[PDB]
From a paper:
Here we demonstrate that ubiquitin variants (UbVs) can be selected from a phage-displayed library and used to specifically and potently block SARS-CoV-2 PLpro activity.
To better understand the mechanism underlying inhibition, we determined the crystal structure of SARS-CoV-2 PLpro in complex with UbV.CV2.1 at a resolution of 3.5 Å. The complex revealed that UbV.CV2.1 bound to PLpro as an asymmetric strand-swapped dimer. Structural superposition showed no overlap between the monomeric UbV.ME.4 inhibitor bound to MERS-CoV PLpro, which bound close to the catalytic site, and the dimeric UbV.CV2.1 bound to SARS-CoV-2 PLpro, which bound to a site far from the catalytic site. However, there was overlap between the N-terminal domain of ISG15 bound to SARS-CoV-2 PLpro and one half of the UbV.CV2.1 dimer, suggesting that UbV.CV2.1 inhibits ISGylation by sterically blocking the interaction between PLpro and the N-terminal domain of ISG15. The contacts between SARS-CoV-2 PLpro and UbV.CV2.1 result in an extensive binding interface with 1063 and 1040 Å2 of surface area buried on the protease and UbV, respectively. The binding site on PLpro can be divided roughly into two halves, which we have termed subsite-1 (412 Å2 that predominantly contacts UbV) and subsite-2 (651 Å2 that predominantly contacts UbV’). Subsite-1 involves hydrophobic burial of one face of the PLpro S2 helix (residues 60–70*, PLpro residues are denoted by asterisks throughout) by the UbV subunit, analogous to interactions of the N-terminal domain of ISG15 with PLpro. Met9’ points toward the solvent, but Arg10’ from UbV’ makes a salt bridge with Glu70* of PLpro. Most importantly, mutations in subsite-1 abrogated inhibition of the polyprotein processing activity of PLpro by UbV.CV2.1, whereas mutations in subsite-2 did not.
Author numbering:
A (entry chain G): 0 to 74
B (entry chain F): 1 to 75
C (entry chain B): 2 to 315
Write the structure that this text describes.
Amino acid sequence: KMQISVKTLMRKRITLEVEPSDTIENVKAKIQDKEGIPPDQQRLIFSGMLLEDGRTLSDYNIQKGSTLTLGLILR
Amino acid sequence: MQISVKTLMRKRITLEVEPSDTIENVKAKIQDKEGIPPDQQRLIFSGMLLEDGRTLSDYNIQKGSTLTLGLILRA
Amino acid sequence: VRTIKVFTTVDNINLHTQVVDMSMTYGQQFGPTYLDGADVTKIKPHNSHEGKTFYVLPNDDTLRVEAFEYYHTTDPSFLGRYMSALNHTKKWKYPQVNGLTSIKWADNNCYLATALLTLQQIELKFNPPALQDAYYRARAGEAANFCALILAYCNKTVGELGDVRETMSYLFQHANLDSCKRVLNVVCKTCGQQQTTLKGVEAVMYMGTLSYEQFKKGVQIPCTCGKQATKYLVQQESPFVMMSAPPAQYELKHGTFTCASEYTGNYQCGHYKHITSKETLYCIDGALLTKSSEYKGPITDVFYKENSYTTTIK
Ligand SMILES: [Br-]
Ligand SMILES: [Br-]
Ligand SMILES: [Zn+2]
């Protein structure tokens, strides 16, 4: 029959467990194991700052309980 | 420690509808398939908010068209 | 504390519910706040507002990703520019002339007329969802939102005179140009030849001749010896091609092109007109339409329709 398709932006909330000295590459990999999103298709945002793929949590002053927002680059 | 990242990923789902069903009927087709309730559902097609009392045809929603779903977030 | 329910958004697709105090101005609680064109940053909320929708600059990362997956920009000053210019384009008029949505002249919008009319004639599919849902509206006779995005994607201000050759370069980088590939070949009498193959935005744009028919035959460029080279089109795979050149008297012939643009005016102060090859040459000047049998004029850009071509030059 008909084949209508809807574009979505589903929202969720996950809880990572990390040591405040890991790298965003290490944090990106925890997302992969926990949800399945590859690190290459992973874009992270924290207070306006695009999370660099080699910087560590501390170089961005990440707290305990502070929440980051994850998007994926257009692919 | 105990860090949480919010995930807002994009998806594309394919509903099966007839070209005479209502936006109330289409909104409910999202509900069974994804779980977003119709009250928290905003749908847009070709730059136009789909009113909750018009049929697909009232928008020329032909077989193959792409709709956009938005969400009335709360807090 | 007197409050009301109102929605903040960045894309007018995902609305965020907000409760606002009726003492402090919008700009105190939300930051810069625009309501469908109007800058309401320094004004207090009124009772009539409950149930409306406001546009706000993205302040929280939840909004940055929302406004990045719809406008495809990282620039913090995009919604500031999109909303600053959409207040003006909403006041313009978009006459439907010759089955096409044009723009009635105001604030030196000459180039947006030819640009918008050319887009309805060549095959373009935009990658950003903002352009995706605003072009759709533009083809239905209402392009208020569409011309605002172009005024932001090109970083031009309402009133700032603009160039069509450059204005279409920004839309093309935000368009589905992936299966477009052009292979050029250059031949010097003493060096032999070199083949260049370029794909994407540069496979539909060229500056140096308006006659596509010439591009197959060749155009002459300086060589690395001190001598003359000859450059010619070997292969072209693209739904269309843009040929552009500095304004000059060029003659357009029926069924030879798809549409063109004319620059009748002086250097750094001018006016654009649009010529399209329907059954007979139509000259679309925004809200005025005049047909003619032939068109000899100061044409600067010519658009040709293509599917796939392979040169016959052995
Ligand atoms: Br609407
Ligand atoms: Br020479
Ligand atoms: Zn040479």
